[PDB]
């Protein structure tokens, strides 16, 4: 990668004849070795490269071998010589007029190889040695962008602009905005008859250079131009008229570049200067008038569909999108491929299990190691006794046995609520069993990191506390109906007049009832109208979590020592159930065949609208509806025939909510009861269902 010094064993007269002979000769790879060997010293190297580039120049500017073939073979020779030892770009940095010759000698065909030339040449600027960046004429370089290129060429352009940003930022940006304005004006003029497939080349060029701008960022001087160009009504007209037509008439692949560019135009960040060696200060801008949110909400469904078409869009194309627009399907796929890019160093470990107690042996063999080792561990499970299944089957059986034993009655770590599970009371769980909750956190974390769908079904309170989400009142409603009714009765009515209760809540401990203050100086504080919501939510947290708190805590450090907290906290508690327990496939026909109705009929218009909505719910949203209405993502093998509620077995039951059209559906997880009110339109019903499942 550095310069090498050799004695002058070759005179400069004969290299001219050598290069001319190579020009009129094939199989020059051996000649490549010859020229590399003779160019060991600096002087002969410089003379050889300057003679070669001058010969290439005369081969095009002013004139045996045909000029095209001779010029392309000179380019190939230059590539194969510069590509080794990296020492030839140093001469380029010393002179820098030869780069001007190269750009001057760059026709429609030269670009395909000139790009690979300049990509390697850019190594000359790695140490920042130019001494005359003003006399480089990068204007013609950036003007070449109109030429016909491919993907690798564009990537090399990205590399070179990253190298030469600190050298030529202002005119680069100016030409960028000029070209963007001309391209969008051309699109605007043809917008009546614009086709994303007929003019695909132009949109490719525009989106390419706009992504180049994003990579580059803008300065404050050109901030005025950038903000002005963020106000193009072409976006509005296209998204409002042509996009609905192009969705059905044209394929999504040719339509994606326009969405990419719409992301780009507001994705630009601010760059001030290259303060660090390689770190560039990036700052984010603002807007006042832009209605990008209106557009992204307008066509969000088909946008999500096109994202489903290509997941790689979220990594390079649609990286600037907000979390809200993306649906849990695409969001979760992106989350998988984002956590799994950190493959790290994974050591494979052979592990022993016994049929009698997998839980204890697994705990012993995993907590000998640390969090990093276990998260990267490739578990080679070998079940004792029976050896007739592959390693994957052994590991799957180990998974299932761990899932069964963590809810085991003898272990009593989690008492079942039906399909889901919750940790038992503080008295039932021994103080020593706190390590098993860290074990369960680790198990679920590695199962998620292994992309394994386990049978760990839990309450929404458990998932909320895992995701640092406050526990809502529905979770306590699931366990205690009278308590929930009392709390909602207190919350809704003006009870402060006749409340006559302090902030603290009594919870009997057999021998005596102690005054547990819910906050600082809690006993002396009474409940008032202003703090009624605070009182209700604090009592909700302290009635259930305060006997389950350290189970959740231990599970928290277990689950976060296997996975990254930041990329996890951006999910919902309902989404966490599909993340941990898996994404089951639920059947709408089986859902409606064995669902009983109260106050309605199977032929009821509103009931039929509900069943049609369930029919057209996507797997994300139908799974969320199942989770909301039934209180669990677990599905029995028989389907809805053997579905159970908290209080014994209970098939799905739909009751009349006796409310207005604007009233939202309510699901009580205690008895698998979904309160279905009277609606006026199918779309209103499906939107209400979507809001209920999303929460």
Automatic annotation (TrEMBL):
It comes from the Eukaryota. This is E3 ubiquitin-protein ligase HUWE1.
């Amino acid at each position: 990668i550095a310069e090498r010094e050799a004695a002058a064993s070759v005179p400069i007269d004969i290299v001219f004849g050598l290069i001319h002979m190579v020009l009129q000769c094939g199989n020059r790879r051996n000649l490549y070795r010859i020229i590399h060997n003779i160019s060991a010293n600096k002087e002969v190297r410089i003379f050889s490269v300057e003679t070669l580039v001058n010969s290439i120049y005369q081969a095009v500017v002013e004139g045996v071998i045909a000029p095209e073939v001779i010029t392309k073979r000179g380019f190939e020779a230059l590539t194969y010589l510069c590509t080794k030892s990296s020492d030839f770009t140093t001469v380029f940095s010393y002179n820098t007029e030869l780069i001007n010759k190269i750009l001057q000698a760059t026709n429609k065909r030269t670009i395909s190889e000139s790009v690979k030339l300049l990509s390697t040449v850019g190594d000359c600027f790695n140490n920042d040695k130019v001494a005359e960046p003003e006399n480089i004429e990068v204007r013609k370089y950036i003007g070449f962008l109109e030429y016909d290129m491919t993907d690798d060429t564009f990537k090399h352009f990205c590399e070179f602009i990253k190298k030469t940003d600190r050298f030529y930022r202002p005119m680069y940006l100016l030409y960028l905005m000029g070209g963007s304005k001309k391209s969008l004006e051309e699109c605007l003029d043809k917008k009546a008859e614009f086709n994303s497939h007929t003019h695909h080349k132009g949109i490719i060029k525009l989106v390419r250079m706009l992504s180049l701008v994003n990579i580059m960022g803008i300065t404050e001087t050109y901030l005025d131009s950038l903000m002005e160009l963020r106000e193009m009504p072409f976006w509005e007209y296209y998204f409002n008229i042509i996009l609905p037509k192009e969705k059905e008439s044209l394929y999504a692949s040719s339509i994606l570049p326009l969405f990419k560019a719409f992301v780009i135009v507001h994705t630009i960040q601010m760059y001030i200067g290259r303060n660090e060696n390689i770190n560039e200060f990036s700052e984010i801008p603002n807007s006042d008038s832009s209605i990008y949110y209106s557009v992204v909400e307008k066509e969000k469904d088909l946008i999500n569909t096109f994202i489903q078409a290509d997941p790689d869009l979220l990594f390079h194309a649609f990286a600037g999108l907000q979390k809200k627009i993306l649906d849990f399907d695409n969001k979760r796929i992106y989350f998988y491929k984002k956590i799994r890019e950190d493959v790290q160093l994974r050591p494979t470990i052979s592990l022993m299990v016994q049929r009698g107690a997998v839980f204890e042996d697994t705990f012993h063999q995993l907590m000998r190691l640390n969090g990093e080792q276990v998260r990267n561990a490739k578990f080679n499970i070998k079940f004792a006794g029976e050896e007739g299944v592959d390693a994957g089957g052994l590991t799957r059986e180990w998974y299932s046995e761990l899932s069964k034993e963590m809810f085991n009655a003898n272990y009593a770590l989690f008492t079942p609520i039906g399909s889901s599970y919750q940790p038992n009371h503080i008295s039932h769980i021994n103080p020593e069993h706190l390590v098993y909750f860290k074990f369960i956190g680790r198990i679920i974390g590695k199962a998620v990191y292994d992309e394994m769908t386990v049978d760990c079904h839990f309450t929404r309170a458990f998932y909320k506390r895992v995701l640092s989400i406050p526990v809502d009142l529905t979770d306590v409603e699931a366990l205690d109906p009278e308590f929930h009714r009392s709390l909602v009765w207190i919350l809704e009515n003006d009870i402060e007049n006749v409340l006559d209760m302090t902030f603290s809540i009594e919870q009997d401990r057999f021998g005596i009832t102690e005054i547990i203050d819910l906050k600082e100086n809690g006993r002396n504080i009474a409940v008032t109208n202003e703090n009624k919501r605070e009182y209700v939510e604090l009592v909700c947290r302290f009635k259930l979590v305060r006997v389950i708190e350290r189970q959740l805590s231990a599970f928290a450090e277990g689950f976060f020592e296997i996975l990254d907290v930041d990329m996890l906290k951006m999910f919902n508690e309902k989404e966490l159930e599909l993340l941990i327990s898996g994404l089951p496939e639920i059947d709408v026909d089986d859902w409606r065949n064995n669902t009983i109705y109260f106050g309605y009929t199977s032929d009821s218009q509103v009931i039929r609208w509900y069943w049609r909505a369930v029919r057209n719910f996507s797997m994300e949203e139908r799974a969320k509806l199942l989770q909301f209405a039934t209180g669990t993502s677990k599905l029995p093998l028989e389907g809805f025939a053997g579905l159970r509620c908290q209080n014994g077995n209970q098939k799905f039951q739909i009751h009349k909510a006796s409310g207005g059209s604007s009233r939202l559906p309510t699901a009580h997880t205690c008895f698998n009861q979904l309160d279905l009110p009277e609606y006026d339109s199918y779309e209103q019903l499906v939107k209400a269902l979507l809001f209920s499942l999303e929460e």
